[PDB]
């Protein structure tokens, strides 16, 4: 039988180009997310900026050219349910997730804090 589910989530991650690409299709190969965003795009950000309903949103604002638009900047000033990564590593951003995998490095503790910190913590 194969009638089962495994929690399908979305993660619009973006920042540069190949550093966030292969780093998003390989991570899913292990978790099973349902694809979302790769590289840094102004059209996608606006979508996750107006959607406020996409599980997560990464948009580095200081790597390869801080292409995180003035919104990733704002997305950090108020923070919403999601996740983010940037040259400063969010900044203690607030959300129902709990910092989780704050990104701004060559991948490492990220995946670690990515799932070991997703306890919600007093939600």
PDB file of C-alpha atoms in Angstrom:
ATOM      1  CA  UNK A   1       0.000   0.000   0.000  1.00  0.00           C
ATOM      2  CA  UNK A   2       1.174   3.609  -0.463  1.00  0.00           C
ATOM      3  CA  UNK A   3      -1.761   5.708   0.812  1.00  0.00           C
ATOM      4  CA  UNK A   4       0.140   7.838   3.354  1.00  0.00           C
ATOM      5  CA  UNK A   5       1.444  11.386   3.945  1.00  0.00           C
ATOM      6  CA  UNK A   6       4.756  12.825   5.155  1.00  0.00           C
ATOM      7  CA  UNK A   7       3.975  16.512   5.788  1.00  0.00           C
ATOM      8  CA  UNK A   8       4.570  18.575   2.625  1.00  0.00           C
ATOM      9  CA  UNK A   9       5.927  22.062   3.436  1.00  0.00           C
ATOM     10  CA  UNK A  10       7.242  24.956   1.281  1.00  0.00           C
ATOM     11  CA  UNK A  11      10.456  26.985   1.666  1.00  0.00           C
ATOM     12  CA  UNK A  12      10.952  29.970  -0.670  1.00  0.00           C
ATOM     13  CA  UNK A  13      14.699  30.175  -0.134  1.00  0.00           C
ATOM     14  CA  UNK A  14      16.738  32.676  -2.116  1.00  0.00           C
ATOM     15  CA  UNK A  15      19.985  34.687  -1.867  1.00  0.00           C
ATOM     16  CA  UNK A  16      22.444  34.301  -4.788  1.00  0.00           C
ATOM     17  CA  UNK A  17      22.346  31.583  -7.484  1.00  0.00           C
ATOM     18  CA  UNK A  18      24.074  28.160  -7.333  1.00  0.00           C
ATOM     19  CA  UNK A  19      24.929  28.484  -3.615  1.00  0.00           C
ATOM     20  CA  UNK A  20      21.213  28.372  -2.712  1.00  0.00           C
ATOM     21  CA  UNK A  21      20.106  26.176  -5.622  1.00  0.00           C
ATOM     22  CA  UNK A  22      21.757  22.734  -5.271  1.00  0.00           C
ATOM     23  CA  UNK A  23      21.583  23.527  -1.535  1.00  0.00           C
ATOM     24  CA  UNK A  24      17.748  23.465  -1.749  1.00  0.00           C
ATOM     25  CA  UNK A  25      17.062  20.501  -4.063  1.00  0.00           C
ATOM     26  CA  UNK A  26      19.419  18.209  -2.133  1.00  0.00           C
ATOM     27  CA  UNK A  27      18.025  19.140   1.294  1.00  0.00           C
ATOM     28  CA  UNK A  28      14.508  18.296   0.093  1.00  0.00           C
ATOM     29  CA  UNK A  29      15.784  14.974  -1.293  1.00  0.00           C
ATOM     30  CA  UNK A  30      16.158  14.112   2.403  1.00  0.00           C
ATOM     31  CA  UNK A  31      13.193  15.920   4.045  1.00  0.00           C
ATOM     32  CA  UNK A  32      10.598  15.887   1.231  1.00  0.00           C
ATOM     33  CA  UNK A  33       9.552  19.576   1.160  1.00  0.00           C
ATOM     34  CA  UNK A  34       7.416  20.591  -1.856  1.00  0.00           C
ATOM     35  CA  UNK A  35       9.912  22.869  -3.724  1.00  0.00           C
ATOM     36  CA  UNK A  36       9.693  26.658  -3.286  1.00  0.00           C
ATOM     37  CA  UNK A  37      12.279  29.333  -4.184  1.00  0.00           C
ATOM     38  CA  UNK A  38      15.930  29.228  -5.296  1.00  0.00           C
ATOM     39  CA  UNK A  39      18.538  31.930  -6.037  1.00  0.00           C
ATOM     40  CA  UNK A  40      17.397  35.500  -5.299  1.00  0.00           C
ATOM     41  CA  UNK A  41      14.397  36.810  -7.238  1.00  0.00           C
ATOM     42  CA  UNK A  42      12.455  40.062  -6.735  1.00  0.00           C
ATOM     43  CA  UNK A  43       9.216  38.549  -8.085  1.00  0.00           C
ATOM     44  CA  UNK A  44       9.290  35.519  -5.763  1.00  0.00           C
ATOM     45  CA  UNK A  45      10.122  37.614  -2.677  1.00  0.00           C
ATOM     46  CA  UNK A  46       7.128  39.884  -3.364  1.00  0.00           C
ATOM     47  CA  UNK A  47       4.986  36.735  -3.545  1.00  0.00           C
ATOM     48  CA  UNK A  48       6.187  35.395  -0.180  1.00  0.00           C
ATOM     49  CA  UNK A  49       6.064  39.024   1.011  1.00  0.00           C
ATOM     50  CA  UNK A  50       2.352  39.270   0.182  1.00  0.00           C
ATOM     51  CA  UNK A  51       1.477  35.599   0.758  1.00  0.00           C
ATOM     52  CA  UNK A  52       2.398  35.525   4.466  1.00  0.00           C
ATOM     53  CA  UNK A  53       1.523  31.836   4.048  1.00  0.00           C
ATOM     54  CA  UNK A  54       4.447  29.859   2.624  1.00  0.00           C
ATOM     55  CA  UNK A  55       5.923  27.984   5.610  1.00  0.00           C
ATOM     56  CA  UNK A  56       9.344  29.728   5.231  1.00  0.00           C
ATOM     57  CA  UNK A  57      11.164  32.633   3.480  1.00  0.00           C
ATOM     58  CA  UNK A  58      14.969  32.936   3.159  1.00  0.00           C
ATOM     59  CA  UNK A  59      16.459  35.982   1.419  1.00  0.00           C
ATOM     60  CA  UNK A  60      20.089  36.801   2.411  1.00  0.00           C
ATOM     61  CA  UNK A  61      20.560  40.603   2.494  1.00  0.00           C
ATOM     62  CA  UNK A  62      24.370  40.738   2.429  1.00  0.00           C
ATOM     63  CA  UNK A  63      25.742  37.798   0.433  1.00  0.00           C
ATOM     64  CA  UNK A  64      26.779  38.148  -3.216  1.00  0.00           C
ATOM     65  CA  UNK A  65      25.145  41.634  -3.231  1.00  0.00           C
ATOM     66  CA  UNK A  66      22.472  41.860  -0.489  1.00  0.00           C
ATOM     67  CA  UNK A  67      19.767  41.229  -3.086  1.00  0.00           C
ATOM     68  CA  UNK A  68      17.216  40.704  -0.270  1.00  0.00           C
ATOM     69  CA  UNK A  69      15.331  43.854  -1.394  1.00  0.00           C
ATOM     70  CA  UNK A  70      13.950  46.352   1.096  1.00  0.00           C
ATOM     71  CA  UNK A  71      11.411  43.668   2.047  1.00  0.00           C
ATOM     72  CA  UNK A  72      13.673  40.870   3.415  1.00  0.00           C
ATOM     73  CA  UNK A  73      14.904  43.856   5.390  1.00  0.00           C
ATOM     74  CA  UNK A  74      11.362  44.531   6.594  1.00  0.00           C
ATOM     75  CA  UNK A  75      10.560  40.822   6.865  1.00  0.00           C
ATOM     76  CA  UNK A  76      13.193  40.975   9.614  1.00  0.00           C
ATOM     77  CA  UNK A  77      11.961  44.181  11.294  1.00  0.00           C
ATOM     78  CA  UNK A  78       8.546  42.632  12.033  1.00  0.00           C
ATOM     79  CA  UNK A  79       9.243  38.947  11.277  1.00  0.00           C
ATOM     80  CA  UNK A  80       6.318  36.545  10.650  1.00  0.00           C
ATOM     81  CA  UNK A  81       5.852  32.730  10.746  1.00  0.00           C
ATOM     82  CA  UNK A  82       8.743  31.609   8.520  1.00  0.00           C
ATOM     83  CA  UNK A  83      12.558  31.599   8.566  1.00  0.00           C
ATOM     84  CA  UNK A  84      15.348  33.763   7.121  1.00  0.00           C
ATOM     85  CA  UNK A  85      19.069  34.025   6.490  1.00  0.00           C
ATOM     86  CA  UNK A  86      21.435  36.953   5.842  1.00  0.00           C
ATOM     87  CA  UNK A  87      24.943  38.335   6.429  1.00  0.00           C
ATOM     88  CA  UNK A  88      23.932  39.083  10.047  1.00  0.00           C
ATOM     89  CA  UNK A  89      22.000  35.811  10.483  1.00  0.00           C
ATOM     90  CA  UNK A  90      18.457  37.174  10.948  1.00  0.00           C
ATOM     91  CA  UNK A  91      19.174  39.039  14.274  1.00  0.00           C
ATOM     92  CA  UNK A  92      17.131  36.990  16.755  1.00  0.00           C
ATOM     93  CA  UNK A  93      14.191  37.327  14.339  1.00  0.00           C
ATOM     94  CA  UNK A  94      10.816  36.395  15.892  1.00  0.00           C
ATOM     95  CA  UNK A  95       8.317  33.819  14.576  1.00  0.00           C
ATOM     96  CA  UNK A  96       6.380  30.657  15.489  1.00  0.00           C
ATOM     97  CA  UNK A  97       9.446  28.685  14.323  1.00  0.00           C
ATOM     98  CA  UNK A  98      12.205  29.872  16.801  1.00  0.00           C
ATOM     99  CA  UNK A  99      15.262  31.044  14.759  1.00  0.00           C
ATOM    100  CA  UNK A 100      15.654  27.444  13.564  1.00  0.00           C
ATOM    101  CA  UNK A 101      18.313  27.293  10.745  1.00  0.00           C
ATOM    102  CA  UNK A 102      19.447  30.918  10.517  1.00  0.00           C
ATOM    103  CA  UNK A 103      21.670  30.963   7.407  1.00  0.00           C
ATOM    104  CA  UNK A 104      24.725  33.000   6.429  1.00  0.00           C
ATOM    105  CA  UNK A 105      27.517  30.362   6.116  1.00  0.00           C
ATOM    106  CA  UNK A 106      28.629  27.539   3.787  1.00  0.00           C
ATOM    107  CA  UNK A 107      25.965  25.153   5.205  1.00  0.00           C
ATOM    108  CA  UNK A 108      26.574  23.261   8.490  1.00  0.00           C
ATOM    109  CA  UNK A 109      24.938  24.015  11.874  1.00  0.00           C
ATOM    110  CA  UNK A 110      22.202  25.316   9.580  1.00  0.00           C
ATOM    111  CA  UNK A 111      20.619  21.916   8.879  1.00  0.00           C
ATOM    112  CA  UNK A 112      21.407  21.130  12.529  1.00  0.00           C
ATOM    113  CA  UNK A 113      19.564  24.123  14.004  1.00  0.00           C
ATOM    114  CA  UNK A 114      17.191  23.639  11.081  1.00  0.00           C
ATOM    115  CA  UNK A 115      15.534  20.613  12.706  1.00  0.00           C
ATOM    116  CA  UNK A 116      16.889  20.501  16.298  1.00  0.00           C
ATOM    117  CA  UNK A 117      15.527  24.009  17.024  1.00  0.00           C
ATOM    118  CA  UNK A 118      12.092  23.516  15.422  1.00  0.00           C
ATOM    119  CA  UNK A 119      10.508  22.780  18.793  1.00  0.00           C
ATOM    120  CA  UNK A 120       8.460  26.007  18.548  1.00  0.00           C
ATOM    121  CA  UNK A 121       9.366  26.861  22.151  1.00  0.00           C
ATOM    122  CA  UNK A 122       6.215  28.165  23.896  1.00  0.00           C
ATOM    123  CA  UNK A 123       5.058  28.556  20.290  1.00  0.00           C
TER     124      UNK A 123
END
